[PDB]
């Protein structure tokens, strides 16, 4: 087993409006090796086969999948916007790519600024996002944005945005 730099937690949020968000939010399991990650990924439903309104997230061990968390409070997210027609082609490969960027610590020195990632499966269009700790850190947010977009292999004409959680609750940067 090949150890990861960090221990990660995979969360699932169920769309069931006959239950509270607490009851619909589930911590599936945690892992700190490549082998344990792959074992987990291959025993859970692909993002593309989730029922509408359902979410996955991966956060560093100790960070709650909530913007009100101390590590997310003053942070934000790089948002990837996928249309209906992209789900079969892009959603799973982009979500897998995102998870590998997290566990692989692919953002060099600014990897510590990474809190986690979220995928939203919605009828109107899906979303992936990488969550960072501080939206004030311009070098960190900009470096993460550039590396992430390159790793997804998105062209220039697809402009991705970074929004602070403060603004979302109520684009600071683009690449």
């Amino acid at each position: 087993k090949h150890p990861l730099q960090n221990r990660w937690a995979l969360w699932f949020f169920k769309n069931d409006k006959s239950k509270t968000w607490q009851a619909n939010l589930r911590l599936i399991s945690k892992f700190d090796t490549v082998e344990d990650f792959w074992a987990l990924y291959n025993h859970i439903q692909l993002s593309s086969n989730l029922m509408p309104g359902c979410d996955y997230s991966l956060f560093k061990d100790g960070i709650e999948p909530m913007w009100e968390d101390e590590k997310n409070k003053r942070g934000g997210r790089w948002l990837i916007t996928l249309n209906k027609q992209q789900r079969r082609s892009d959603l799973d490969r982009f979500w897998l790519e995102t998870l590998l960027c997290l566990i692989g610590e692919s953002f060099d020195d600014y990897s510590d600024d990474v809190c986690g990632a979220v995928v939203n499966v919605r009828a109107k269009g899906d979303k992936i996002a990488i969550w960072t700790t501080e939206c004030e850190n311009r070098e960190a947010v900009t470096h993460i944005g550039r590396v992430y977009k390159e790793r997804l292999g998105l062209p220039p004409k697809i402009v991705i945005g970074y929004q602070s959680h403060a603004d979302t609750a109520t684009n600071r940067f683009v690449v």
Binding site: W21, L25, R77, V118
Partner: peptide
């Protein structure tokens, strides 16, 4: 705006 991370709008 009910989604993972922003549960205040899920009430």
């Amino acid at each position: 705006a009910c989604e993972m991370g922003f549960f205040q709008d899920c009430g």
